[PDB]
Structures are given as C-alpha cells and as structure tokens.
C-alpha cells in the first residue's frame, strides 16, 4: 500500500529485528566485550520444535545450539568465523515457554567463550558451551560433482525407513525433522554418505534469520546413521554430543544435499565430518567432528538397559463392570468340593441352565473325554468352569500333585480346543495358586497351572483361557458374578470380597526393592544420606563397612554432630562446591577415638575429640585425618563441641582474625538468630563492638530486640542500608558479616565506611561470578572470602587450630554457647524442614545413638553375593548358562563352585573347567539327577567340604521338551517338571537338612523362563514347570528363607547377550526382589500381538 506507507511515514512503532532463537541482544557495560541474549525456545513460540522428541518428550535438538553458536559469531567477532569445540551438556526439555540465555565473552582477540544456559527458580543449568573464532582463514572447500557423487553411491536408503528406525531407540522426528528424503551409500569400505536433505515446505517461510535452520541441520546429522558401518557397529541410541568445528560459507536456503564422511565408528560412539551442498555442489556449511553417542557413561548405559529389560507381574484392585447355558467340571471326584457345589447353585440361582461333569484322576480319560465332547455338541454353552480340587502344608506332596493337575488340565483343555462349533470360554478356578497380597503364603499344586492356561490362551485364543485364583473366604455369589459379567481379564484373583486383576509391567525400582537390614549403633557402620537431593523423604540411613584407619587417620565414635545450613543446601541439592562434587551430610562432629591409624603420636585411643571430616559426620563412626581432630578440653562435651565448631570457627576467623574486630567499631550481623549469627553476637559483645543485626521474620527480629540489641532490621530487603545510615548519622558500619546475596551484598558494601571490612561467608555470589563494582573500595575497604570447607583441604592445620581455639574459649567461658536444640538421628529430616523454612533459632544438633539399640538400615550394593570365604552350588552347570555363570563367578572371586549336571562333562566343557582351575578358583564337578534327593545332599556336602559355608545356590538345571497341546504327552510333562520343581524342593531340603554351614546363605536363585510369563506356544509343559518354581520362590521368601527367580529371555551363546545377563543376574541379587523378568521388550512381535489380544499387557500397548 503506497498510501498506507506514506501515512505511516509519521507514526512508526519502535521495533527491532532479532534472531529467532537468540532473541534480544544486550552488550554488557564491562570489559571484556561481553554479549548476552535472552530468548524463548518453547513449543508455543516455535511449534516445529515439538516435532523433535526423545522418549515422547519434546527436547531441544543438538542442531539448535549449533545455530545459536554460528549466529553469535558475527556480532561478537565482527567478521567471518568458526565455532570450535561445541559441547552439549544436559538435555533441554521444552514446555510452551522455555526462556534461554546465550552469552559470549571475548577472552583473547579473535576468540570468545560461548555458552547457552537456562535459569529455573534461581538454579542455572548449562546446556551448551563452545569457542568462537574469527581469526580463522577463509578456506572454502571446493564444490563437488553431485552427478559423480551420486554415481559413486548407488545403494539408496529411504528417509522414512531410517526415521522409523530412530523411533525404536526412542528418538522421534516429526514433520519438521523429516527433511532427509533419502541417503545414498555404497559399502562399509567406502566411508561417505550422499544425502538428499531439504528444509520442509512449512518451514521454508520460517527460514527468517537462521544461519542454518536447526530442522535442516538435524536432518544432516540423521544422514550419518544411514552409513552401513554405523548401522552394523553402533546399533544403539545415537544422539549428537558436540561438534569440533562449524563454519558457514554462505546461505543454506538452497541446500539440497549433505555429504557425510565417517571418521570413526565404534561401539561407544561415531565421529563424522559433514558438508552441506547446494544443487550445483558448492559447499554452504561444514561440520567437522560431529560427535554422536550413547548419551552418558558406559556404566550408566548398563543401568539404563537393565531397567528397560526387567519385568514383574502386579495386581490391581478392580471392580466387576457392566451391564446362556453353562458347564461346571471338576478335577478330583473322591474330594467333595464346596466351591464346585456353591458355584453350580449360584449359577442356577442367577438363572442359567448349568450341567455338572466329574472328571477325576485315575479314571478312563479317553471315555470321559468322549463324554465331554458329546455334552458340547449336544447343547451350545457360553462358558465352561474348571474347578480344580484341593487335597485335604507339605510342599513335597504338593510338588508331586502339581504335575498330576497339569497333566489333567491338558486332557481337559485338549478336548475343548477340539470342538466342532464355536469353543466356549474356558474359566479355570484355582485355590490360592499364586501370590497377590503381600501377606499371602501360596498354596501350591495349582501353582503350575498359571503357565499352562497362559499357553492354552495363546495356542487356542477362541476359548479365552481365563484363570480365577480364589481363597477360602470369598463367597460363591461374588465368584459367579465374574463368570456372568464377561470381563476380558485373563488373569484374575479373589481375596475376601475384593476382585484383583494382574497386569505385566517393568518395575526396576531401588526403594523397597532394595535390601534391608538391622544394625547395632555401638558396633556396625550406619550413616545418614539423601539418595536424591531435593526430596527430604529420600533421606536414608545407609550402612558402611567401618575399616581400619591409617596412615595418619583416626576412627572416631561420634556421640553427636551439628546441622549447619550448608547441610540443608546439600539436602535440597542447592549446595555450591569448588570440587564440583556435592558434599556429604555432616561437616563437624564430637566423639571419642576408636582407633588410631599407623602412625600418629598426636592422638590416643579413648581421647574425647571434636573435629571435621566430610565423608558423612551423621554416623556412628567417622574416619577423619589427624590434621582435623583435636582433644576436647574438660569444660565442653562432645555435643557442646559438635555445635560450636564451625559457627564459632567461621566467626573467629572472620571477625577477630581477618577483620581484626576492634572494640567500639560497628558491626552488621546478617540473620543473627542463626548459629553463625549467635556466635557473631557473642564475639562482637566480647570485643565490645556496637551490633546492628538483621532477620527475616518479625518474631525473629523481636527476639534480637529482646536479646538487648537495639538496631534490628529486615534481612530480606535492602532497607537496612539506608536505615543504618540514618541510625549512625551517615557513618554506616565498619565490619559486615555478609551471609546475604545479590543487591543486599552490594548494599552492605556501600554501607561500611573507611574501616571497611566486608567478610563474605556467603558462597552464592562468588560461585555465580558476580561482577562486584569496585568503586566503594575508594575508602580503603577490604573484602574477605571465607570457605572453611575448602580450607579443611588446602590448610587443615589452620582449621585444626581454629577449632581448638574456639573449643578453648567456649570451655574457659570466654564465649557463651548459643541456643542448641537437640534432634535424634531419626528426626533429622524434620530439623531440615524447620531450619530450611527459617523457623529455627540458634543451633540444631544431631544426637547419634550411643546405645546397644538396633536401627533399621539399607545395604545398597555392599551386598556380598560373590565371595572367596563362601562356597556355591550350580545345577545345570556343565552346560548352557550355568557354565558361563560359573566361569564369570570364578573370575568374580569365588571359593569352591560345585557344578552339577546328570550327564558327564563334554570335551569343550572339560576345557573350560581346566582353564578356570588353572586360574586359581577351584571348580568341583559332582554329577547327578537333582530330581533324586541324594544328589542335592551330595552337592551341598561337596561344596562345604573345603571348610567353606554355602553362601548361594543357582537352579539352572532344566529340560525342554516342546509340543502343541494336542501332542503334549503325560510322560513329556514329567520330563520338564522333574528337574525344575523336584530339584528345587530337593535343593531347599538339602539346605535345611545341612548343618550350620548351609544355614548362612545369602541367596537361592532359580532360572525361570519368559515363556511362562507371556505364554510362548508349544512350550506348555516347560511353562507350567516354571510357574510352579516361580511360586515356590515366593513361598520360600514367605517362610523367611532367601529366594529369587529370573524369567530369562533369548540368549546368544533383540535377544539377550551373554555379558548383558551376567550384570543383570549380579544386580538382581544385590536387590530384595523375588520375581524378576529379564527379556528383550522394545517393540517385539510377540508383545504387540499379546497386548492387543488380552488386557493383561495393557501398559505395553500404550
């Protein structure tokens, strides 16, 4: 509109052009040339950013920081430049609004430090850092022949096919990030990829002021994965971690191709060099040294894999929802079932024509099978309820009976499957078959049937194989309610009047699923720590092995320790440290020497001492250096010294030592109601200084006024400054014990006059690199930084003397001790909530229990598991997993490993045992059929023989005979059942039967199968044997004995690897969880098929 422009040539709105990401730019008024941008990278501001998402959560791609760095070059360094050593730190998770701060600072001419950070509730989080360089030479790589390149790379890779592959590992690329059309490759020998990238149509409008659009640059990074050497080697989650050198030669608007080159292709990561070419082949941008990789740590990769692979069955309290003839059939005729009687009466009571069948063991099964098939063809029925009979506490009997039930349910299930018409719904009613409520002790016999009904439902889904695990107390009126409601639930249970329903889920927790113990407080190590800072509920009492001290160290028996404000920040994760590592809870202590390490003349055992250590002083025993402890004088207790130490030390150092607090001079004590505050008052009163104090609460301020201190102000504002200037007739103060921050720090410096002694104890502003204006220093001011924590490492003698001098002054009575409020170790979190909320006054002391009392404690991975002072037994050790585990255990440090297998050792097995015995650890081989009882005893006696107590068992012994329900013979059931169930019981008995050597074991593990859990068709007999063995472990745990079961997946020698399972096995044992299911889950065919068929795997579909 030529008119609109001429009339608008007068009222113009004041606006300025900005970068889409970087946003508003400000150059700070300081040397060196320091720049600063503030901008939004939220999904509301930049919709297209929602299309890049890791694990279904929108995150900022690596490519975004690349653009930000490239963009920040020209304004800082007014020239053509590069971006060197660009690194991506934490993963930025995007919201509707995600403000981000970029900042570049000139270090040297033609060089500048770059950095993208994000600020949340005061806490800064660095997201990326690099170096900008302008001095670099204009070395534009020569244009390429797009025709020749594409001719040299004939093998085409589709973009959608590759982006689908990214979705499996967890990385999602939406419409915006689908720029990669297709990538052309050749072989692994050829290290290059010619990719056909292009910024999608919607984003072409939004090319705006981008050096390179991050959507486009990420599509180039995707192109690197199309290389065959990358696909073959690094078959894991590859995320960009950084870029060695980034330069833009021109506009990337017309980029149509991306030429990649593999520098290095390793299992850990992939390095590559990129070049963005236009249609002609001219280079527009180059990325040398693009580093991709498995996000963080090698050990953190294992921990993450283990979590995804684990599986557990969980029971949910459910209600029967919404809105034909029936047949009730039995499994024991000589046993009169009131459940069967009551069910038939309740179905007829509901108004359904019910018939009853009496199939029992030791009966003509071919004739009864024909009688059943006749009843089905005679009348069309809706469902068939199979009532399993319960005989009449002996497990031995229930293990033998459990086989007969499986053999009999196969006979019944086979005849229902072989139906001319539409098969009716099968309902199997078992008596306390499996564990649902934590209080339950499982009734076996029916334990094996849950694996069979799961396989029958998979082999023959027409008849929806449903299981109903009933208890004695429940009522038949509520049971038939389930049969007639027709809910699609396949695994169900009844405990009292409540209906439960199973559901498969991964649960790799480490809270209740971690070992527990009880430990003495006089003996045995126990320490207090936060498993994850921020949450005070995560404050745990952990165990530690208190070892011999030395050289030049001392073990102290702590009677008490303090709670400093520093220990609160540690609890919330807000504590700053020069080391970088977050310190341990408890800095100071007061105790009695336990042991003196070789060799120190200074300390003696039984000396009452107080000191410092780190390493957690909220524990019964602390090992501290001789440099950090001092004998307490007679005038003070362990608890008095534990409170005083740091508060008075910091003050002593700060006021009387650094600031040389003279008499009469005015002192400003910030937050004077606290520990350091009360200590400051004490020495200020002693020195004869005029006190000016501050405090947050009115109640807290009024306390200072009552303590006899005139001149009290608010610590949360900058009022105190002008108020003190008025209350001193413009003089101000002399000394300032600054615990406060920000403008209150600056205001405090501006306050003190001539004498000027600013003592900063507060670390926040130092670690934040706050540019402190030097102009107030024109009056001979003196700034003092104080970090006793650091001093304890750099000059421990000065800290020794500083503690020793305050313990002397306080014991002499030269200084009076402050308000001390004791807290038992248990209520430590409560003291933190109080201190952390500014509710407290004075000092808070943690009292350590000097008693013969016991306290419940948690061993994380201090668990023994594999040890040289203990023997081990492995059934099925001469082959399969057992031989790999035995070899791994011998290497892990095990004294005597008895290996068993009914067959003699093979030629390759004997060779493996020879090299293990050659490399120290002895391996005994005692053959036998574990199904026979004498074998279990012979094994146990052999493992103990070398003066070693049995510390663990492994039940890998197994037979696998697979057959379809139609051809599952009665003999084949006993073949698979015998080693798994009879061996497990004979092992259990051999352990109890054994003397005190066997009554000391740490674990009892049993290798189960994932086929029992899901229902792999054809297994059946093997599946049922495992479901009994899985329930047997929950029963063994219920009795108190240790017990474990690991339902394994598919091993190698997509499928579990050998060394992958070794870590999982060892890990599962470090934790107190009975059922563990290690199996490759990802997005497998058998899981996607199982999730859509039944609501048991509801959480897997999502």
Which residues are marked as active site?
Answer: 52, 218
717 touches which of ligand NAP, a second copy, none (CB within 5 to 8 A by kind)?
Answer: a second copy
Binding flag, residue 124, a second copy (CB under 8 A): yes
Residue 611 counted as an annotated binding residue: no
Query: Cα–Cα distance between 218 and 195 in angstroms, integer?
Result: 12
Work out how close the CB of 657 gets to ligand NAP at its nearest, in angstroms, rounded to a whole number: 13
Work out how close the CB of 684 gets to ligand NAP at its nearest, in angstroms, rounded to a whole number: 15
Summarize the chain as % helix, strand, coil (round to 5): 35, 25, 40
Tokens coding 335: 């046993």
The count of chain residues that interact with a second copy, using the rule CB under 8 A, is 24
Q: Which stretch binds a second copy (CB under 8 A): 109-117, 198-206, 360-368, 499-507?
A: 109-117
Residue 828 counted as an annotated binding residue: no
Binding flag, residue 566, ligand NAP (CB under 6 A): yes
Q: What 3-state DSSP class applies to 990? A: helix
Work out how close the CB of 680 gets to a second copy at its nearest, in angstroms, rounded to a whole number: 24
Instruction: Tell me the per-residue interface mask from 744 to 783 with a second copy, x by CB under 8 A, - otherwise.
Output: x--x-------------------------x-x--------
Given a contact cutoff of 8 angstroms between Cβ atoms, the answer to whether 445 and 401 are in contact is yes
330 touches which of ligand NAP, a second copy, none (CB within 5 to 8 A by kind)?
Answer: none
Strands (E) in 916-988, as ranges, are 923-925, 950-955
Exposure b/e, 226-257, CB count within 10 A at least 16 = b: bbbbbbebbeebbbbbbbbbbbbbeebeebbb
How many CB atoms neighbour CB 122 within 10 A? Answer: 9
Query: Cα–Cα distance between 335 and 860 in angstroms, integer?
Result: 49
Q: What 3-state DSSP class applies to 1048? A: strand
878 touches which of a second copy, ligand NAP, none (CB within 5 to 8 A by kind)?
Answer: ligand NAP
DSSP 8-state assignment for residue 629: E
Work out how close the CB of 90 gets to a second copy at its nearest, in angstroms, rounded to a whole number: 14
122 touches which of ligand NAP, a second copy, none (CB within 5 to 8 A by kind)?
Answer: a second copy
Which residue, 27 or 1101, is less far from a second copy as judged by CB? 27
Map the footprint of a second copy across residues 681-740, applying CB under 8 A: 716-719
Binding flag, residue 910, ligand NAP (CB under 6 A): no
Binding flag, residue 880, ligand NAP (CB under 6 A): yes
How many CB atoms neighbour CB 96 within 10 A? Answer: 10
Which residue, 697 or 989, is less far from ligand NAP as judged by CB? 697
Residue 383 counted as an annotated binding residue: no
Given a contact cutoff of 8 angstroms between Cβ atoms, the answer to whether 567 and 843 are in contact is no
CA 435, 437, 438, 442 torsion-angle sign: negative
Which residue, 869 or 911, is less far from ligand NAP as judged by CB? 911
Tokens coding 272: 């590559």
Residue 662 counted as an annotated binding residue: no
Binding flag, residue 905, ligand NAP (CB under 6 A): no
Q: Are strands 325-330 and 354-358 parallel, antiparallel or unpaired?
A: parallel
Map the footprint of ligand NAP across residues 975-1004, applying CB under 6 A: 979
Binding flag, residue 718, ligand NAP (CB under 6 A): no
The count of chain residues that interact with ligand NAP, using the rule CB under 6 A, is 46
Give me the phi and psi of 85, to 5 degrees please. 40, 55
DSSP H or E stretch at residue 693: strand 690-695
Strands (E) in 795-942, as ranges, are 820-824, 843-847, 854-857, 871-875, 897-900, 923-925
Return left, alpha or beta for 110; rule: phi > 0 is left, psi -120 to 50 is alpha, else beta: left
Tokens coding 602: 């200074």
Given a contact cutoff of 8 angstroms between Cβ atoms, the answer to whether 565 and 631 are in contact is no
Q: Which stretch binds ligand NAP (CB under 6 A): 201-209, 540-548, 955-963, 1023-1031?
A: 955-963
Instruction: Tell me the per-residue interface mask from 606 to 645 with ligand NAP, x by CB under 6 A, - otherwise.
Output: ----------------------------------------
Return left, alpha or beta for 328; rule: phi > 0 is left, psi -120 to 50 is alpha, else beta: beta
Contacts of 211 (CB under 8 A, 6+ apart): 67, 70, 71, 248, 252, 285
CA 992, 994, 996, 1001 torsion-angle sign: negative
Work out how close the CB of 108 gets to a second copy at its nearest, in angstroms, rounded to a whole number: 4
Residue 1007 counted as an annotated binding residue: yes
Work out how close the CB of 881 gets to ligand NAP at its nearest, in angstroms, rounded to a whole number: 6
Residue 879 counted as an annotated binding residue: yes
101 touches which of ligand NAP, a second copy, none (CB within 5 to 8 A by kind)?
Answer: a second copy
Q: Where are the alpha helices (DSSP H) in 20-153?
A: 62-76, 146-152
207 touches which of a second copy, ligand NAP, none (CB within 5 to 8 A by kind)?
Answer: none
Which residue, 707 or 777, is less far from a second copy as judged by CB? 777
DSSP 8-state assignment for residue 437: S
Query: Cα–Cα distance between 408 and 401 in angstroms, integer?
Result: 11
108 touches which of a second copy, ligand NAP, none (CB within 5 to 8 A by kind)?
Answer: a second copy
413 touches which of ligand NAP, a second copy, none (CB within 5 to 8 A by kind)?
Answer: none
Which residue, 131 or 891, is less far from a second copy as judged by CB? 131
Q: What 3-state DSSP class applies to 381? A: strand
Which residue, 566 or 744, is less far from a second copy as judged by CB? 744
Q: Which stretch binds a second copy (CB under 8 A): 102-110, 645-653, 908-916, 996-1004?
A: 102-110
1077 touches which of a second copy, ligand NAP, none (CB within 5 to 8 A by kind)?
Answer: none
Tokens coding 215: 């959507």
Work out how close the CB of 711 gets to a second copy at its nearest, in angstroms, rounded to a whole number: 19
Among 958, 991, 1023, 1047, binds ligand NAP (CB under 6 A): 958
Q: Where are the alpha helices (DSSP H) in 418-550?
A: 449-459, 476-485
Q: What 3-state DSSP class applies to 948? A: coil
Q: Where are the alpha helices (DSSP H) in 663-727?
A: 675-687, 698-706, 719-727
Given a contact cutoff of 8 angstroms between Cβ atoms, the answer to whether 198 and 237 are in contact is no
Query: Cα–Cα distance between 840 and 700 in angstroms, integer?
Result: 9
DSSP H or E stretch at residue 430: strand 425-431
Work out how close the CB of 135 gets to a second copy at its nearest, in angstroms, rounded to a whole number: 13
Instruction: Tell me the per-residue interface mask from 672 to 711 with ligand NAP, x by CB under 6 A, - otherwise.
Output: -xxxxx-----------------xxx--x-----------
Instruction: Tell me the per-residue interface mask from 142 to 181 with ligand NAP, x by CB under 6 A, - otherwise.
Output: ----------------------------------------
Which residue, 395 or 761, is less far from ligand NAP as judged by CB? 761
Q: Are strands 897-900 and 923-925 parallel, antiparallel or unpaired?
A: parallel
Q: What 3-state DSSP class applies to 493? A: strand
Which residue, 483 or 930, is less far from ligand NAP as judged by CB? 930
Query: Cα–Cα distance between 561 and 609 in angstroms, integer?
Result: 12
Taking each helix axis from N to C terminus, what angle separates 675-687 and 638-651, rounded to the nearest 10 degrees?
70
Query: Cα–Cα distance between 753 and 778 in angstroms, integer?
Result: 10
715 touches which of ligand NAP, a second copy, none (CB within 5 to 8 A by kind)?
Answer: ligand NAP
Among 252, 368, 715, 1019, binds ligand NAP (CB under 6 A): 715
Binding flag, residue 98, a second copy (CB under 8 A): no
Interacting residue ranges for ligand NAP, rule: CB under 6 A: 564-566, 646-647, 650, 671, 673-677, 695-697, 700, 715, 739, 761-763, 786-789, 836, 838, 875-876, 878-882, 900-903, 929-931, 956-959, 979
Residue ranges of the annotated binding site for NADP(+) are 878-881, 901-904, 929-930, 1007-1008
Interacting residue ranges for a second copy, rule: CB under 8 A: 29-31, 101, 105, 107-108, 111, 113, 117-119, 122, 124, 716-719, 742-744, 747, 773, 775
Residue ranges of the annotated binding site are 878-881, 901-904, 929-930, 1007-1008
């Amino acid at each position: 509109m030529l008119d609109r422009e001429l009339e608008s040539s007068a009222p113009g709105v004041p606006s300025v052009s900005v970068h889409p990401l970087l946003g508003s730019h400000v150059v700070l008024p300081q040397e060196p040339e320091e720049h600063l941008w503030q901008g939004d990278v939220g999904t509301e501001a930049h919709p297209w950013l929602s299309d890049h998402r890791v694990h279904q959560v929108a995150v900022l791609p690596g490519a975004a920081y690349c653009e930000m760095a490239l963009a920040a070059v020209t304004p800082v360094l007014g020239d053509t430049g590069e971006v060197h050593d660009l690194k991506f730190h934490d993963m930025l998770l995007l919201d509707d609004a995600t403000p981000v701060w970029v900042s570049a600072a000139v270090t040297a001419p033609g060089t500048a430090e770059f950095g993208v950070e994000t600020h949340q509730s005061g806490d800064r989080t660095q997201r990326a850092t690099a170096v900008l360089r302008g001095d670099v030479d204009a070395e534009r790589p020569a244009a390429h022949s797009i025709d020749a390149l594409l001719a040299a790379h004939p093998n085409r890779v589709d973009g959608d096919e590759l982006r689908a592959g990214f979705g499996t590992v967890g990385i999602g690329h939406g419409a915006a990030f689908a720029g990669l059309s297709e990538a052309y490759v050749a072989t692994a020998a050829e290290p290059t990829v010619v990719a056909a990238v292009a910024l999608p149509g919607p984003l072409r409008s939004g090319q705006r002021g981008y050096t390179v659009h991050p959507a486009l640059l990420d599509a180039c990074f995707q192109s690197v994965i199309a290389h065959p050497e990358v696909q073959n080697i690094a078959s894991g989650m590859l995320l960009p971690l950084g870029v060695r050198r980034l330069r833009a030669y021109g506009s990337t608007r017309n980029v149509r191709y991306c030429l990649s080159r593999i520098v290095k292709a390793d299992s850990f990561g992939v390095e590559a060099d990129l070049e963005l070419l236009d249609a002609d082949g001219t280079v527009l941008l180059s990325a040398m040294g693009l580093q991709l990789g498995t996000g963080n740590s090698d050990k953190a990769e294992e921990e993450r894999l283990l979590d995804e692979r684990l599986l557990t069955i969980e029971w949910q309290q459910r209600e029967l929802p919404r809105p034909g003839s029936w047949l009730v059939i039995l499994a024991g005729d000589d046993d009169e079932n009131p459940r069967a009687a009551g069910v038939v009466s309740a179905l007829i009571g509901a108004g359904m024509p019910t018939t009853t069948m009496a199939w029992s063991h030791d009966a003509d099964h071919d004739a009864q099978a024909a009688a059943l098939t006749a009843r089905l063809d005679e009348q069309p029925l809706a469902g068939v309820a199979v009532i399993v009979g319960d005989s009449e506490h002996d497990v031995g009997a229930d293990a033998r009976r459990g086989a007969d039930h499986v053999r009999h349910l196969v006979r019944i299930a086979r005849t229902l499957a072989d139906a001319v018409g539409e098969p009716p719904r099968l309902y199997v009613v078992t008596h306390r078959s499996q564990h649902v409520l934590d209080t339950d002790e499982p009734y076996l016999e029916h334990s094996g049937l849950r694996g069979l009904i799961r396989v029958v439902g998979m082999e023959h889904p027409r008849l929806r194989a449903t299981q109903i695990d009933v208890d004695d107390s429940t009522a038949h009126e509520a049971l038939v309610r389930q049969l007639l409601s027709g809910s699609p639930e396949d695994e169900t249970a009844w405990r009292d009047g409540q209906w439960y329903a199973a559901r498969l889920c991964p649960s790799p927790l480490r809270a209740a699923e971690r070992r527990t113990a009880v430990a003495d407080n006089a003996s045995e190590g126990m320490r207090l720590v936060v498993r994850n800072p921020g949450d005070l509920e995560s404050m745990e009492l952990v165990t530690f092995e208190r070892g011999t001290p030395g050289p030049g160290q001392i073990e102290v028996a702590v009677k008490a320790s303090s709670i400093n404000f520093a220990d609160v920040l540690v609890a919330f994760g807000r504590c700053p440290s020069f080391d970088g590592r977050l310190p341990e809870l408890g800095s100071e202590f007061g105790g009695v020497v336990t042991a003196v390490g070789p060799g120190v003349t200074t300390h003696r055992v039984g000396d009452r001492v107080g000191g410092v250590s780190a390493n957690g002083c909220w524990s019964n025993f602390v090992t501290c250096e001789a440099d950090l402890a001092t004998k307490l004088p007679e005038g003070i207790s362990e608890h008095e010294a534990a409170a005083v130490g740091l508060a008075y030390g910091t003050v002593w150092l700060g006021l009387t030592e650094l600031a040389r607090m003279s008499a009469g001079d005015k002192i400003l004590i910030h937050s004077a109601t606290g520990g350091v505050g009360q200590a400051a008052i004490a020495v200020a009163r002693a020195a004869g200084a005029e006190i000016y104090a501050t405090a947050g609460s009115e109640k807290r301020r009024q306390l200072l006024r009552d303590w006899g201190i005139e001149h009290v102000y608010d610590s949360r504002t900058t009022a105190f400054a002008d108020q003190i200037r008025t209350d001193t007739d413009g003089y101000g103060v002399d000394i300032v014990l600054n615990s406060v921050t920000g403008p209150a720090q600056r205001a405090g410096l501006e306050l003190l006059a001539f004498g000027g002694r600013f003592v900063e104890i507060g670390k926040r502003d130092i670690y934040a690199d706050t540019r402190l204006g030097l102009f107030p220093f024109r009056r001979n001011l003196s700034f003092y930084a104080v970090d006793l924590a650091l001093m304890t490492v750099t000059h421990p003698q000065k800290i020794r003397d500083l503690l020793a001098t305050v313990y002397r002054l306080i014991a002499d009575g030269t200084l009076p001790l402050p308000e001390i409020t004791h807290y038992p170790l248990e209520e430590a979190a409560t003291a933190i909530r109080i201190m952390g909320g500014a509710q407290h006054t004075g000092k808070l002391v943690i009292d350590i229990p000097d008693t013969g009392q016991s306290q419940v404690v948690v061993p994380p991975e201090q668990v023994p598991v594999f040890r040289g002072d203990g023997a081990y037994v492995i059934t099925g050790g001469l082959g399969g997993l057992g031989l790999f585990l035995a070899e791994r255990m011998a290497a892990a440090g095990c004294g005597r490993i008895v290996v068993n297998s009914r067959s003699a050792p093979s030629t390759r097995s004997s060779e493996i045992i020879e090299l293990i015995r050659a490399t120290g650890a002895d391996i005994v081989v005692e053959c036998g059929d574990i199904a026979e009882p004498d074998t279990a005893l012979r094994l146990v006696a052999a493992a103990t023989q070398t003066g070693l107590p049995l510390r663990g068992v492994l039940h890998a012994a197994a037979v696998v005979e697979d057959a379809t329900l139609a051809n599952i013979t009665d003999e084949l059931v006993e073949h698979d059942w015998a080693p798994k169930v009879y061996g497990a019981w004979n092992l259990h008995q051999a352990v109890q039967s054994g003397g005190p050597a066997t009554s000391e074991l740490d674990w009892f593990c049993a290798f189960s199968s994932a086929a029992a859990l899901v229902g792999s068709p054809g297994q059946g007999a093997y599946a049922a044997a495992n479901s009994w063995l899985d329930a047997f472990m929950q029963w063994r745990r219920a009795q108190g004995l240790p017990a474990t079961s690991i339902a394994w997946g598919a091993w190698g020698e997509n499928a579990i690897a050998p060394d992958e399972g070794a870590y999982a096995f060892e890990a599962i044992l470090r934790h107190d969880r009975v059922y563990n299911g290690y199996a490759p889950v990802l997005g497998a065919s058998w899981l996607t098929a199982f999730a859509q068929r039944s609501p048991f795997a509801e959480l897997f579909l999502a």
